[PDB]
Amino acid sequence: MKQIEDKLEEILSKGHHICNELARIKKLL
Amino acid sequence: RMKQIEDKLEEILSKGHHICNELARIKKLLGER
Amino acid sequence: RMKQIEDKLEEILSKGHHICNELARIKKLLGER
Amino acid sequence: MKQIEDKLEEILSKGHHICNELARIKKLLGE
């Protein structure tokens, strides 16, 4: 379970990064 | 055409935030039992 | 409870694949004009 | 423009990675 939970938190944190990137791209366009 | 793409990006990053919230919920549940 | 979480992960999977397809579409459009 | 495209390709790349990871996790929980 700890590996699953740590992987979901990794994916979480990358999804947040992806949302920030798409926000940045939207503003440039 | 550009306004359509900007609005689609806003939609996707909204859905992306929702997905992340759903995964955080799942992570919480999986740690309890 | 576990079956519910597995089914939700399959929903999220599907939605993430759809999102990627949408972004690939956007990437195509933005390179044309 | 090339910067934007290359970032979108990085992102959807990583999205495919995320989907494979979630598919792996679903299988593990199926136990």
UniProtKB/Swiss-Prot annotation, chain D:
Gene disruption phenotype: Abolishes recruitment of the mediator complex to the upstream activating sequence (UAS) of amino-acid starvation responsive genes. Decreases RNA level of genes involved in amino acid biosynthesis and cofactor biosynthesis during amino acid starvation or methyl methanesulfonate stress. Growth dependent on amino acid supplementation. Sensitive to amino acid starvation. Sensitive to purine starvation. Decreases cellular glycogen levels during glucose starvation.
Induction of expression: Translation is induced by amino acid or purine starvation, or during growth in low or poor carbon sources. Translational repression during nutrient-rich conditions is dependent on four uORFs (upstream open reading frames) present in the 5'-UTR of the mRNA; these promote ribosome dissociation. Translational induction occurs in conditions reducing translation machinery efficiency, leading to ribosomes scanning over the uORFs, and increased translation of the mRNA. The rapid translational induction is followed by transcriptional induction at later time-points, independently of the uORF sequences.
Domain of life (superkingdom): Eukaryota
Gene name of the encoded protein: GCN4
Coiled coil: none
PTM statement from Swiss-Prot or TrEMBL: Phosphorylated by the cyclin-CDK PCL5-PHO85.
Entry's family note: Belongs to the bZIP family. GCN4 subfamily.
Segments for region (Leucine-zipper): 4-25
This protein's domain notes: Residues 89 to 100 and 106 to 125 define the N-terminal activation domain (NTAD) and the central acidic activation domain (CAAD) respectively, which can function independently to promote high-level transcription of the target genes.
Subunit structure: Homodimer. Each subunit binds overlapping and non-identical half-sites that flank the central CG base-pair in the pseudo-palindromic motif 5'-ATGA[CG]TCAT-3'. Interacts with the mediator tail; the interaction with GAL11/MED15 is direct. Interacts with the SAGA histone acetyltransferase complex. Interacts with the SWI/SNF chromatin remodeling complex.
Name of this chain's protein: General control transcription factor GCN4
Role noted for this protein: Master transcriptional regulator that mediates the response to amino acid starvation. Binds variations of the DNA sequence 5'-ATGA[CG]TCAT-3' in canonical nucleosome-depleted 5'-positioned promoters, and also within coding sequences and 3' non-coding regions. During nutrient starvation (low or poor amino acid, carbon or purine sources), it activates genes required for amino acid biosynthesis and transport, autophagy, cofactor biosynthesis and transport, mitochondrial transport, and additional downstream transcription factors.
Localization (cell): Nucleus
